[PDB]
Amino acid sequence: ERTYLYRGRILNLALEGRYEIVEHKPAVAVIALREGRMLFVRQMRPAVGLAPLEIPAGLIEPGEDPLEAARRELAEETGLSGDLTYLFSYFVSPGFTDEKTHVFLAENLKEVEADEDEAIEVVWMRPEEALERHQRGEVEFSATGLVGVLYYHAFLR
Amino acid sequence: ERTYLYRGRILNLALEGRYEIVEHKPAVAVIALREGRMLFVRQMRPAVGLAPLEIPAGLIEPGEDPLEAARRELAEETGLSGDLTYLFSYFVSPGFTDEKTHVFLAENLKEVEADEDEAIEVVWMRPEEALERHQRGEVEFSATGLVGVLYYHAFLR
Ligand SMILES: Nc1ncnc2c1ncn2[C@@H]1O[C@H](COP(=O)(O)OP(=O)(O)OC[C@H]2O[C@H](O)[C@H](O)[C@@H]2O)[C@@H](O)[C@H]1O
Ligand SMILES: Nc1ncnc2c1ncn2[C@@H]1O[C@H](COP(=O)(O)OP(=O)(O)OC[C@H]2O[C@H](O)[C@H](O)[C@@H]2O)[C@@H](O)[C@H]1O
Ligand SMILES: [Mn+2]
Ligand SMILES: [Mn+2]
Ligand SMILES: [Mn+2]
Ligand SMILES: [Mn+2]
Incomplete structure (x- = not known):
């Protein structure tokens, strides 16, 4: 039985007994390799106060399925x-x-x-170099960025 | 300038201008391989209404650093x-x-x-089999479970 404390734009906060639960729209992320470079993006993320290395990602909008959202996010x-x-x-x-x-x-x-969306920086980078920059403390990863780097090393070399 | 809407046990909800931001304690996760099996865990997760395949993970407690939290979570x-x-x-x-x-x-x-903590199921499983079960729709991953599987395929074979 959820009781809602906040209904927002991209999340709801609920309590379910003693559990604090954040409902959030589903997301997509796209791994893309070209000439040994992976397609990363960076943008200021107010939640963390910095711009982590991510792969192109977005929320699924009403009416869309994951594949369609992925196509849209990659283009936008x-x-x-x-x-x-x-x-x-x-x-x-x-x-x-x-x-x-x-x-x-x-x-x-x-x-x-x-x-085309200007607040997002397109960062083509070899995944080996993204992992090295991270190990040296020079960039932070989102989960999607880390998943892209690890998937490349597992399956795309 | 954050304005707090909810201060909780393992999260805070804030607004920062138009952004909805959830503050949350940092976490640790441990990847462990033995005889070709990775150490997964499963537990009911009320936020998702199911038990995804995770690796042992926990929140860092006051006074602890990540390594110490990782040791504790793995033991508990x-x-x-x-x-x-x-x-x-x-x-x-x-x-x-x-x-x-x-x-x-x-x-x-x-x-x-x-x-020793009984509400968590210890699931030793070959990472190849965890990935196959997921591809066939039989189990869901957490980010930590997926990161463990991809790290194994990239670097531990
Ligand atoms: N915290 C927020 N609160 C309010 N609105 C937001 C916030 N963040 C962005 N917007 C608005 O919502 C629109 C969202 O932009 P889209 O590209 O579809 O999603 P994404 O890249 O943010 O999130 C994709 C995933 O990547 C990350 O891991 C995320 O946490 C997600 O898991 C924005 O343009 C803003 O107008
Ligand atoms: N939503 C919640 N609200 C309130 N208390 C909670 C909740 N969930 C658990 N507790 C309490 O808090 C204690 C937390 O148990 P620990 O093992 O350190 O953390 P973890 O495994 O949950 O989270 C580790 C990561 O794995 C996942 O990806 C998570 O989202 C984290 O990112 C519990 O025993 C409960 O008493
Ligand atoms: Mn985005
Ligand atoms: Mn977008
Ligand atoms: Mn745990
Ligand atoms: Mn625990």
Whole structure:
């Protein structure tokens, strides 16, 4: 039996007995490799006060399914389209939120727009270099960035 | 300038201008391999209404640093100790929360207690089989479970 303390724009806060639960829209993320570089993005994230290394990601909007949201996010954040394949999903932090992320691979990328959402920085970077910069403390990862780097090292070399 | 709407036990909800922000304690997670099996755990997670495949994980308590929290969580959840090495960290979902997870590798595991926290199920499973069960829809992953599986395939085979 959830009791709602806050109903917001991209989350709700509820109590369920002693549990504090954040309801959140599902998300998508896209792993894309070109010429040995992975497609990362960075943007200021007020929750953390910095810009972590992420892969293109977004929330699924009403009416959309994960594949469609992934296509849209990739185009809006980086100006690209590609051939998308579903990989796997994960709960970001199931001890307190129901946010679920669906991860896709993109191949054969083409520019469909001149990126285009300006507050997001497109960062093509070899995943080996992203991992080294992180190990040396020079950049933070989001879960989606780390998943992209680890998936590359597992399956795309 | 954060304005607090809710101060809780393991999270705070704040507004910062138009942003909804969940402050949350940092976490740790431990990747451990023995005889080709990875150490997973499962427990009911009221936020998601199911028991995803996770690796042993917990919140850092007052006074502790990540390594110490990792040692404690591994012992409390699975009854084991091992030689711990820091791997990397990630923000679970930096579009709305500051929760950061520090991930460790454990080697040379030994039983120090007869597991011991009973509401957590210890699930030794080959990571190849965890990935196959997930692909067939039979189990959900947390981020920590997925990170463990991908790290194994990248670096531990
Ligand atoms: N939503 C909640 N609200 C209130 N208290 C909680 C909640 N969940 C657990 N507790 C209490 O807090 C104690 C927490 O148990 P520990 O093992 O240190 O942490 P973890 O495994 O939950 O979370 C570790 C990470 O794994 C997941 O990804 C999480 O989202 C975290 O990112 C519990 O025993 C309960 O008493
Ligand atoms: N905390 C917030 N509160 C209010 N509105 C927000 C917030 N953050 C962004 N917006 C608004 O909502 C729109 C969201 O932009 P989209 O690209 O679909 O999602 P994403 O990249 O943020 O999140 C994708 C995932 O990546 C991260 O891991 C996240 O935590 C998610 O798990 C914004 O343009 C803002 O207008
Ligand atoms: Mn985005
Ligand atoms: Mn977007
Ligand atoms: Mn735990
Ligand atoms: Mn615990």
